[PDB]
Coordinates of N, CA and C in Angstrom, one line a residue:
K2 N 38.9 43.6 119.7 CA 38.4 43.0 121.0 C 39.5 42.1 121.6
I3 N 40.5 41.6 120.8 CA 41.6 41.0 121.4 C 42.9 41.7 121.0
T4 N 43.8 41.8 121.9 CA 45.1 42.5 121.7 C 46.2 41.4 121.6
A5 N 47.1 41.6 120.7 CA 48.1 40.6 120.4 C 49.2 40.8 121.4
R6 N 49.8 39.7 121.9 CA 51.0 39.7 122.7 C 52.2 39.7 121.8
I7 N 53.3 40.3 122.3 CA 54.4 40.7 121.4 C 55.6 39.8 121.6
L8 N 56.0 39.2 120.6 CA 57.3 38.5 120.5 C 58.2 39.3 119.6
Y9 N 59.3 39.8 120.2 CA 60.1 40.8 119.5 C 61.5 40.2 119.1
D10 N 61.8 40.4 117.9 CA 63.1 39.8 117.3 C 64.2 40.8 117.7
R11 N 64.7 40.7 118.9 CA 65.7 41.7 119.4 C 67.0 41.6 118.6
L12 N 67.4 42.6 117.9 CA 68.6 42.6 117.1 C 69.8 43.1 117.9
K13 N 69.6 43.5 119.1 CA 70.8 44.0 119.9 C 72.0 43.0 119.8
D14 N 73.1 43.6 119.5 CA 74.4 43.0 119.5 C 74.7 42.1 118.2
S15 N 73.7 42.0 117.3 CA 73.9 41.3 116.1 C 74.6 42.2 115.1
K16 N 75.2 41.5 114.1 CA 76.0 42.3 113.0 C 75.1 43.2 112.3
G17 N 75.6 44.4 112.0 CA 74.9 45.4 111.3 C 75.2 46.8 111.7
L18 N 74.4 47.8 111.2 CA 74.6 49.2 111.5 C 73.5 49.6 112.5
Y19 N 73.9 50.1 113.7 CA 73.0 50.4 114.8 C 73.1 51.9 115.0
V20 N 72.0 52.6 114.7 CA 71.9 54.1 114.9 C 70.9 54.3 116.0
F21 N 71.3 55.2 116.9 CA 70.5 55.4 118.1 C 70.6 56.8 118.6
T22 N 69.8 57.2 119.6 CA 69.8 58.5 120.2 C 69.6 58.3 121.7
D23 N 70.2 59.1 122.5 CA 70.0 58.9 124.0 C 69.0 60.0 124.5
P24 N 68.2 59.7 125.5 CA 67.5 60.7 126.2 C 68.4 61.8 126.7
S25 N 68.0 63.1 126.6 CA 68.8 64.2 127.1 C 69.0 64.0 128.6
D26 N 70.0 64.6 129.2 CA 70.3 64.5 130.6 C 69.1 64.8 131.4
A27 N 68.4 65.9 131.1 CA 67.1 66.2 131.8 C 66.1 65.1 131.7
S28 N 66.0 64.5 130.5 CA 65.0 63.4 130.3 C 65.5 62.1 131.1
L29 N 66.8 61.9 131.2 CA 67.2 60.7 132.0 C 66.7 60.8 133.4
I30 N 66.8 62.0 134.0 CA 66.3 62.2 135.3 C 64.8 62.0 135.4
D31 N 64.1 62.5 134.4 CA 62.6 62.4 134.4 C 62.2 60.9 134.3
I32 N 62.9 60.1 133.5 CA 62.6 58.7 133.4 C 62.9 58.0 134.7
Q33 N 64.1 58.3 135.3 CA 64.5 57.7 136.5 C 63.5 58.0 137.7
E34 N 63.0 59.2 137.7 CA 61.9 59.6 138.7 C 60.7 58.7 138.5
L35 N 60.3 58.6 137.2 CA 59.1 57.8 136.8 C 59.2 56.4 137.4
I36 N 60.3 55.7 137.3 CA 60.4 54.3 137.7 C 61.1 54.2 139.1
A37 N 61.1 55.3 139.9 CA 61.8 55.3 141.2 C 61.3 54.2 142.2
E38 N 60.0 53.8 142.0 CA 59.5 52.8 142.9 C 59.5 51.3 142.3
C39 N 60.3 51.2 141.2 CA 60.3 49.9 140.6 C 60.8 48.8 141.5
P40 N 60.1 47.7 141.7 CA 60.6 46.6 142.6 C 61.5 45.6 141.9
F41 N 61.7 45.6 140.6 CA 62.6 44.7 140.0 C 63.8 45.5 139.4
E42 N 64.8 44.7 139.0 CA 66.1 45.3 138.6 C 65.9 45.9 137.2
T43 N 66.4 47.2 137.1 CA 66.3 47.9 135.8 C 67.7 48.3 135.3
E44 N 67.7 48.4 134.0 CA 69.0 48.9 133.3 C 69.4 50.2 133.9
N45 N 70.7 50.4 134.0 CA 71.2 51.8 134.4 C 70.9 52.8 133.3
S46 N 70.7 54.0 133.7 CA 70.4 55.1 132.8 C 71.4 55.2 131.6
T47 N 72.7 54.8 131.8 CA 73.7 54.8 130.7 C 73.3 53.8 129.6
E48 N 72.4 52.8 129.9 CA 72.1 51.8 128.9 C 70.8 52.1 128.2
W49 N 70.2 53.3 128.5 CA 68.9 53.7 127.8 C 69.3 54.3 126.5
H50 N 69.2 53.6 125.4 CA 69.4 54.1 124.1 C 68.2 53.8 123.3
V51 N 67.8 54.8 122.4 CA 66.6 54.6 121.5 C 67.1 54.3 120.1
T52 N 66.8 53.1 119.6 CA 67.2 52.7 118.3 C 66.4 53.5 117.3
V53 N 67.0 54.1 116.3 CA 66.4 54.7 115.1 C 66.7 53.9 113.9
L54 N 67.6 53.0 113.9 CA 67.9 52.1 112.7 C 68.7 50.9 113.2
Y55 N 68.4 49.7 112.7 CA 69.2 48.5 112.9 C 69.2 47.9 111.5
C56 N 70.2 48.2 110.7 CA 70.3 47.7 109.3 C 71.2 46.5 109.3
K57 N 70.6 45.4 108.7 CA 71.3 44.1 108.7 C 72.0 43.9 107.4
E58 N 72.1 44.8 106.5 CA 72.8 44.7 105.2 C 74.2 44.3 105.4
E59 N 74.7 43.3 104.5 CA 76.1 42.8 104.7 C 77.1 43.9 104.3
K60 N 76.8 44.8 103.3 CA 77.7 45.8 103.0 C 77.1 47.1 103.4
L61 N 77.9 47.9 104.2 CA 77.4 49.1 104.9 C 78.4 50.2 104.7
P62 N 78.0 51.5 104.7 CA 78.9 52.6 104.6 C 79.6 52.9 105.9
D63 N 80.7 53.7 105.7 CA 81.4 54.1 106.9 C 80.7 55.2 107.7
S64 N 80.0 56.1 107.0 CA 79.2 57.2 107.6 C 77.9 57.3 106.9
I65 N 76.9 58.0 107.5 CA 75.6 58.2 107.0 C 75.2 59.6 107.2
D66 N 74.3 60.1 106.3 CA 73.7 61.4 106.4 C 72.6 61.5 107.5
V67 N 72.6 62.5 108.3 CA 71.5 62.6 109.3 C 70.7 63.9 109.0
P68 N 69.4 63.9 109.5 CA 68.6 65.1 109.3 C 69.2 66.3 110.0
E69 N 68.8 67.5 109.7 CA 69.2 68.7 110.4 C 69.1 68.5 111.9
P70 N 70.1 68.8 112.7 CA 70.0 68.6 114.1 C 68.8 69.4 114.7
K71 N 68.1 68.8 115.7 CA 67.0 69.5 116.4 C 66.9 68.8 117.7
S72 N 66.1 69.5 118.6 CA 65.6 68.8 119.8 C 64.6 67.8 119.5
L73 N 65.0 66.6 119.3 CA 64.0 65.5 119.1 C 63.1 65.2 120.3
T74 N 61.8 65.1 120.1 CA 60.9 65.0 121.1 C 60.0 63.7 121.0
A75 N 59.6 63.2 122.2 CA 58.6 62.1 122.2 C 57.8 62.2 123.4
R76 N 56.6 61.5 123.4 CA 55.8 61.3 124.6 C 56.1 59.9 125.1
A77 N 56.3 59.7 126.4 CA 56.4 58.4 127.0 C 55.0 57.8 127.1
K78 N 54.7 56.9 126.2 CA 53.3 56.4 126.1 C 52.9 55.5 127.3
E79 N 53.7 54.5 127.5 CA 53.4 53.4 128.4 C 54.6 52.5 128.5
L80 N 54.6 51.7 129.6 CA 55.5 50.6 129.8 C 54.8 49.3 129.5
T81 N 55.4 48.4 128.9 CA 54.8 47.1 128.6 C 55.9 46.0 128.6
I82 N 55.5 44.8 128.6 CA 56.4 43.6 128.6 C 56.2 42.8 127.3
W83 N 57.3 42.7 126.6 CA 57.5 41.8 125.5 C 58.3 40.6 125.9
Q84 N 58.3 39.6 125.0 CA 59.2 38.5 125.1 C 60.0 38.4 123.9
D85 N 61.3 37.9 124.0 CA 62.2 37.7 122.9 C 62.1 36.3 122.4
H86 N 62.9 36.0 121.4 CA 62.8 34.6 120.8 C 63.1 33.5 121.8
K87 N 63.8 33.8 122.9 CA 64.1 32.8 123.9 C 63.1 32.8 125.0
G88 N 62.1 33.5 125.0 CA 61.1 33.6 126.0 C 61.4 34.5 127.2
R89 N 62.4 35.3 127.1 CA 62.8 36.2 128.1 C 62.0 37.5 128.1
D90 N 61.7 38.1 129.2 CA 60.9 39.3 129.3 C 61.7 40.5 129.1
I91 N 61.2 41.4 128.3 CA 61.7 42.8 128.1 C 60.7 43.8 128.5
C92 N 61.0 44.6 129.5 CA 60.2 45.7 129.9 C 60.7 46.9 129.1
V93 N 59.8 47.5 128.2 CA 60.1 48.6 127.3 C 59.2 49.7 127.6
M94 N 59.7 50.9 127.4 CA 58.9 52.1 127.3 C 58.6 52.4 125.9
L95 N 57.3 52.5 125.5 CA 56.9 52.8 124.2 C 56.8 54.3 124.0
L96 N 57.3 54.8 122.9 CA 57.4 56.2 122.6 C 56.5 56.6 121.4
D97 N 55.7 57.6 121.6 CA 54.9 58.2 120.6 C 55.8 59.4 120.0
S98 N 56.3 59.3 118.8 CA 57.3 60.3 118.4 C 57.4 60.4 116.9
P99 N 56.6 61.3 116.3 CA 56.8 61.6 114.8 C 58.3 61.9 114.5
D100 N 59.0 62.5 115.4 CA 60.4 62.8 115.2 C 61.2 61.6 115.0
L101 N 61.1 60.6 115.9 CA 61.9 59.4 115.8 C 61.5 58.6 114.6
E102 N 60.2 58.6 114.3 CA 59.7 57.8 113.1 C 60.3 58.5 111.8
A103 N 60.3 59.8 111.8 CA 60.8 60.5 110.6 C 62.3 60.3 110.4
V104 N 63.1 60.3 111.5 CA 64.5 60.0 111.5 C 64.7 58.6 110.9
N105 N 64.0 57.6 111.5 CA 64.0 56.3 110.9 C 63.8 56.3 109.4
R106 N 62.7 56.9 109.0 CA 62.4 57.0 107.6 C 63.5 57.6 106.8
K107 N 64.0 58.7 107.2 CA 65.1 59.4 106.5 C 66.4 58.5 106.4
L108 N 66.7 57.8 107.4 CA 67.9 56.9 107.4 C 67.6 55.8 106.4
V109 N 66.4 55.2 106.4 CA 66.1 54.1 105.5 C 66.2 54.5 104.0
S110 N 65.8 55.8 103.8 CA 65.8 56.4 102.5 C 67.2 56.4 101.8
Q111 N 68.2 56.2 102.6 CA 69.6 56.1 102.1 C 70.0 54.7 101.6
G112 N 69.0 53.9 101.4 CA 69.3 52.5 101.0 C 69.8 51.6 102.2
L113 N 69.3 51.9 103.4 CA 69.6 51.2 104.6 C 68.3 50.6 105.2
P114 N 67.8 49.5 104.7 CA 66.6 48.9 105.2 C 66.7 48.6 106.7
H115 N 65.6 48.9 107.4 CA 65.5 48.6 108.9 C 65.2 47.1 109.1
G116 N 65.8 46.6 110.2 CA 65.8 45.1 110.4 C 64.5 44.6 110.9
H117 N 63.5 45.4 111.2 CA 62.1 45.0 111.4 C 61.2 45.5 110.4
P118 N 60.1 44.7 110.0 CA 59.2 45.2 108.9 C 58.6 46.5 109.2
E119 N 58.4 46.9 110.5 CA 57.8 48.1 110.9 C 58.7 48.7 112.0
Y120 N 58.9 50.1 111.9 CA 59.7 50.7 113.0 C 58.9 50.9 114.2
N121 N 59.5 50.6 115.4 CA 58.9 50.7 116.7 C 59.8 51.5 117.6
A122 N 59.4 52.8 117.9 CA 60.2 53.6 118.8 C 60.0 53.2 120.2
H123 N 61.0 52.7 120.9 CA 61.0 52.3 122.3 C 62.3 52.4 122.9
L124 N 62.4 52.3 124.2 CA 63.6 52.1 124.9 C 63.4 51.0 126.0
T125 N 64.5 50.3 126.2 CA 64.4 49.1 127.1 C 64.8 49.5 128.5
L126 N 63.9 49.2 129.4 CA 64.1 49.5 130.8 C 64.6 48.3 131.7
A127 N 64.3 47.1 131.2 CA 64.7 45.9 132.0 C 64.6 44.7 131.1
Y128 N 65.4 43.7 131.5 CA 65.5 42.4 130.7 C 65.8 41.3 131.6
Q129 N 65.0 40.2 131.5 CA 65.2 39.0 132.4 C 65.0 39.4 133.8
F130 N 64.0 40.2 134.1 CA 63.7 40.7 135.5 C 62.7 39.8 136.2
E131 N 62.5 40.1 137.5 CA 61.6 39.3 138.3 C 60.1 39.7 137.9
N132 N 59.5 38.9 137.1 CA 58.1 39.3 136.6 C 57.1 38.6 137.4
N133 N 56.7 39.2 138.5 CA 55.7 38.7 139.4 C 54.6 39.7 139.5
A134 N 53.6 39.4 140.4 CA 52.5 40.3 140.5 C 52.9 41.7 140.9
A135 N 54.0 41.8 141.7 CA 54.5 43.2 142.1 C 55.0 43.9 140.9
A136 N 55.7 43.2 140.0 CA 56.2 43.9 138.8 C 55.1 44.4 138.0
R137 N 54.1 43.5 137.7 CA 53.0 43.9 136.8 C 52.2 45.0 137.5
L138 N 52.0 45.0 138.8 CA 51.3 46.1 139.5 C 52.0 47.4 139.3
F139 N 53.3 47.4 139.5 CA 54.1 48.6 139.3 C 54.0 49.2 137.9
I140 N 53.9 48.3 136.9 CA 53.9 48.7 135.5 C 52.5 49.4 135.3
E141 N 51.4 48.8 135.8 CA 50.1 49.4 135.7 C 50.1 50.8 136.4
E142 N 50.7 50.9 137.6 CA 50.7 52.2 138.3 C 51.5 53.2 137.5
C143 N 52.6 52.8 136.9 CA 53.4 53.7 136.0 C 52.6 54.2 134.8
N144 N 51.8 53.2 134.2 CA 51.0 53.6 133.1 C 49.9 54.6 133.4
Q145 N 49.2 54.4 134.6 CA 48.3 55.4 135.1 C 49.0 56.8 135.2
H146 N 50.2 56.8 135.8 CA 50.9 58.0 136.0 C 51.3 58.7 134.7
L147 N 51.6 57.9 133.7 CA 51.9 58.4 132.3 C 50.7 59.0 131.7
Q148 N 49.5 58.6 132.1 CA 48.2 59.2 131.6 C 47.9 60.4 132.4
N149 N 47.9 60.3 133.7 CA 47.6 61.5 134.6 C 48.6 62.6 134.5
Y150 N 49.8 62.3 134.2 CA 50.9 63.3 134.2 C 51.7 63.0 133.0
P151 N 51.3 63.5 131.8 CA 52.0 63.2 130.6 C 53.5 63.5 130.7
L152 N 54.3 62.6 130.2 CA 55.7 62.7 130.2 C 56.3 62.9 128.8
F153 N 56.9 64.1 128.6 CA 57.5 64.4 127.3 C 59.0 64.3 127.5
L154 N 59.7 63.8 126.5 CA 61.1 63.5 126.5 C 61.8 64.2 125.3
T155 N 63.1 64.5 125.5 CA 63.9 65.0 124.4 C 65.2 64.1 124.3
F156 N 65.8 64.1 123.1 CA 66.9 63.2 122.8 C 68.0 63.9 122.1
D157 N 69.2 63.4 122.4 CA 70.5 64.0 121.9 C 70.7 63.8 120.4
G158 N 71.9 64.1 120.0 CA 72.3 63.9 118.6 C 72.5 62.4 118.3
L159 N 72.3 62.0 117.1 CA 72.4 60.6 116.7 C 73.8 60.1 116.8
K160 N 73.9 58.8 117.2 CA 75.2 58.1 117.2 C 75.0 56.7 116.5
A161 N 76.1 56.2 116.0 CA 76.1 55.0 115.2 C 77.2 54.1 115.6
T162 N 76.9 52.8 115.7 CA 77.8 51.7 116.0 C 77.7 50.7 114.9
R163 N 78.8 50.2 114.3 CA 78.7 49.1 113.4 C 79.3 47.8 114.0
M164 N 78.5 46.8 114.1 CA 78.9 45.5 114.6 C 79.4 44.8 113.3
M165 N 80.8 44.6 113.2 CA 81.4 44.2 112.0 C 81.9 42.7 112.2

């Protein structure tokens, strides 16, 4: 009967091993169309990366094994607003994706614990934006559109960055 509001421990740019996948070029356009009426500032498409692992271990390998390549798929479930440890707003697109969850699981199975207690598939669309009634109304209209017109996404091959 009550829903919890989300304070997210954003590991972006901190030391560790960051494994991610990008929406396919086709999916980048589909997402951009989705948010084409957004009244607040959004991250450029080039900045849309989907984390599949953020491992904070102090000793890390140079390379990692990845699952057999495939067209990874997700449904764009909804847009929502989280806050980070500093109180700043994050607008994220939540992803329903057994594929991304299984990738996360397979990567962790190599002795690379994920930096959050539970894996959450999402991509970040805005940060420190103008969060007013117009912003929240746009997000609600986007969420209705994601229900009335289901949006399915595909993602590229995995990439990894080590913040050393």
